Design a protein around this ligand. Structure first.
Ligand SMILES: Nc1ncnc2c1ncn2[C@@H]1O[C@H](COP(=O)(O)OP(=O)(O)OP(=O)(O)O)[C@@H](O)[C@H]1O
Ligand SMILES: Nc1nc2c(ncn2[C@@H]2O[C@H](COP(=O)(O)OP(=O)(O)O)[C@@H](O)[C@H]2O)c(=O)[nH]1
Ligand SMILES: [Mg+2]
Lengths: 192, 349
């Protein structure tokens, strides 16, 4: 249903919230009352019309298929290339992942996408992550890997990953400090 | 798990399968040097089973085909952190002990170049420092390991301990070891004398020497020991390190200098440094050159499966999902087949 502003624009008149609600109730009654074409043609004058983007699969020089993606977490940006076939190796910045991320939490984050779609040990990954700390880098690489793997999993699996939150870019970033207070939300100790 | 427990017969046929160490052999050969976490595992399981791996197999092959006439060869086990260097070295140590070699086992040369409360000055050479605590500890461990040859080996010089006390040519090396252990002020000198005597007598065919040094890169690196004047001390000023350096030369024969690099516990080395030059430095590589580097890598899938099965048979993986294929894949991914990471994860899983 068009908004009160749209209805006002059509009627070149100033309306009220309750007037708009009355009119919308009347139109809804009209819709429910088996409105045919003769009535639907009128009604539609007041109607206003209202999935992951799979990357293309590229091919290297040696003919191996892969998918490239990127993901950002906090200040960390990661570019990940996932090959169609592999032995589960993950090389981050040219270093093996268990060496780059000595933290079990970060290794678990790397695992989370592949483990979810039941493709552990089936894909090789080459990731390059810059900026942020260890955890931000792990999250960015996780997002990039999930997006790249979307090209190799089925559409139902892609939707399941999206529902599990493996393809959403975490918008949580550090909140700026504000003048006159200790931090983003911390206030200076009040002195009654 | 292999029925074979002799450390001389197992070969490629037993690769990726376990090899037992009897409690007596563990208490005799290994009073020191075993990884702390492996010692904890041994105490918990009541068993000491080491997977036989290609590094240990190759080093055993070399030691069996060695020609004692030729100068003692230097073998250097190198690999990423927690790949199994120390345990491969311990496997070879056990093989040599069962073959009746004299095992001169330094459990961690790093300990000798850091965290030393008692740093006196050597009476034999005033330009060098003593580490009585470490010297006495290692002397006790050495006596425990090689007591059998300790009475059969005689000294070939006169060794003055005090201005009045001395040990005479023809005396057992047990006298030297006992003097060092009992009189802690003479521990470093006893270690030096023992090293000299073993090095010289290995050339005479009296026995076969295995100088098994873990963390060998500590000798030619830096140290975190400061003089009373807050002045840093290089390794050569330490009497123990200097004597072990002398031992590490191939000028002698009748044995083998087996050693293992270890970034863990090293000083002023980055976490990801594992290559021979990266860990040894110019001085260390110059000293060891020529040497045979042996790569210790993560578990291959067969070894990983064998280790997981060993833990499951011991019931260590108490998590209900560990036996599942999905749990095994998760373990493999988390540890990337790294022995230390897999063991640590299974320690609480
Ligand atoms: N060949 C092996 N057989 C059985 N367990 C092994 C073996 N190699 C490594 N491990 C396991 O890994 C741990 C010992 O690792 P080890 O000390 O050999 O690694 P390292 O790389 O030499 O150590 P560091 O980190 O000091 O370099 C123990 O938990 C042990 O059970
Ligand atoms: N107290 C004592 N230590 C000795 C004796 N002989 C050898 N050592 C030990 O071995 C070291 C000397 O080794 P040596 O072969 O003489 O070579 P050097 O160190 O170059 O003189 C001393 O610092 C001691 O640790 C001895 O007669 N008395
Ligand atoms: Mg080690």
């Amino acid at each position: 249903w068009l908004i009160k502003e749209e209805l006002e624009e059509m009627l070149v008149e100033k309306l009220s919230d309750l007037d708009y609600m009355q009119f919308i109730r009347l139109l809804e009654k009209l819709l429910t009352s088996q409105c045919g074409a003769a009535e639907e043609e009128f009604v539609q004058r007041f109607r206003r019309s209202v999935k992951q983007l799979i990357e293309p699969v590229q091919y290297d020089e040696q003919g191996m298929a892969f998918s490239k993606s990127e993901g950002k977490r906090k200040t960390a940006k990661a570019e990940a290339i996932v090959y169609k076939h592999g032995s589960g190796r993950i090389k981050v910045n040219g270093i093996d992942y268990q060496l780059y991320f000595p933290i079990t939490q970060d290794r678990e984050q790397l695992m989370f996408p592949f483990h979810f779609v039941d493709r552990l040990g089936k894909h090789d990954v080459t990731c390059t992550v810059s900026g942020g700390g260890r955890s931000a880098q792990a999250g960015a690489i996780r997002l990039a890997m999930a997006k790249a793997l979307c090209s190799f999993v089925t559409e139902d699996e892609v939707e399941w990953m999206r529902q599990a939150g493996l393809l959403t870019t975490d918008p949580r970033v550090r909140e700026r400090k504000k003048p006159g207070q200790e931090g983003a939300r911390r206030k200076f100790t009040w002195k009654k | 798990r292999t029925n074979e427990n002799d450390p001389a017969k197992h070969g490629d046929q037993h690769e990726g399968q376990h090899y037992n160490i009897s409690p007596q052999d563990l208490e005799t050969v290994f009073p020191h040097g075993l990884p702390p976490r492996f010692v904890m595992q041994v105490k918990t399981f009541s068993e000491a089973c080491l997977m036989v791996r290609k590094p240990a197999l190759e080093l055993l092959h070399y030691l069996k085909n060695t020609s004692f006439a030729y100068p003692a060869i230097r073998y250097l086990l190198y690999g990423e952190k927690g790949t199994g260097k120390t345990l491969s070295l311990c496997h070879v140590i056990h093989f040599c002990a069962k073959q009746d070699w004299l095992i001169l086992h330094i459990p961690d040369a790093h300990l000798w170049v850091k965290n030393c409360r008692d740093l006196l000055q050597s009476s034999y050479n005033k330009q060098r420092f003593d580490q009585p605590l470490e010297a006495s500890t290692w002397l006790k461990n050495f006596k425990t390991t090689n007591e059998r040859f300790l009475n059969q080996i005689k000294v070939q010089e006169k060794y003055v301990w005090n201005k009045r006390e001395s040990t005479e040519k023809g005396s057992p090396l047990g006298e030297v070891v006992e003097q060092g252990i009992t009189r802690v002020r003479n521990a470093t000198d006893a270690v030096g004398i023992v090293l000299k005597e073993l090095k010289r007598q290995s050339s005479l065919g009296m026995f076969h020497l295995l100088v098994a040094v873990d963390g060998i890169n500590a000798l030619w690196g830096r140290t975190t020991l400061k003089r009373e004047d807050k002045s840093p001390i290089a390794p050569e000023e330490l009497a123990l390190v200097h004597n072990l350096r002398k031992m590490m030369k191939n000028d002698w024969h009748g044995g083998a200098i087996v050693s293992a690099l270890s970034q863990t516990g090293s000083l002023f080395k980055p976490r990801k440094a594992y290559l021979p030059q990266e860990l040894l430095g110019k001085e260390g590589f110059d000293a060891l050159d020529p040497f045979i580097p042996i790569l210790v890598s993560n578990y291959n899938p067969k070894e990983f499966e064998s280790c997981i099965q060993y833990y499951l048979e011991n019931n260590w993986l108490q998590h209900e999902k560990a036996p599942t294929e999905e749990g095994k894949k998760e373990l493999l991914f988390l540890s990337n087949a790294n022995p230390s990471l897999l063991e640590r994860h299974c320690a609480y899983l």
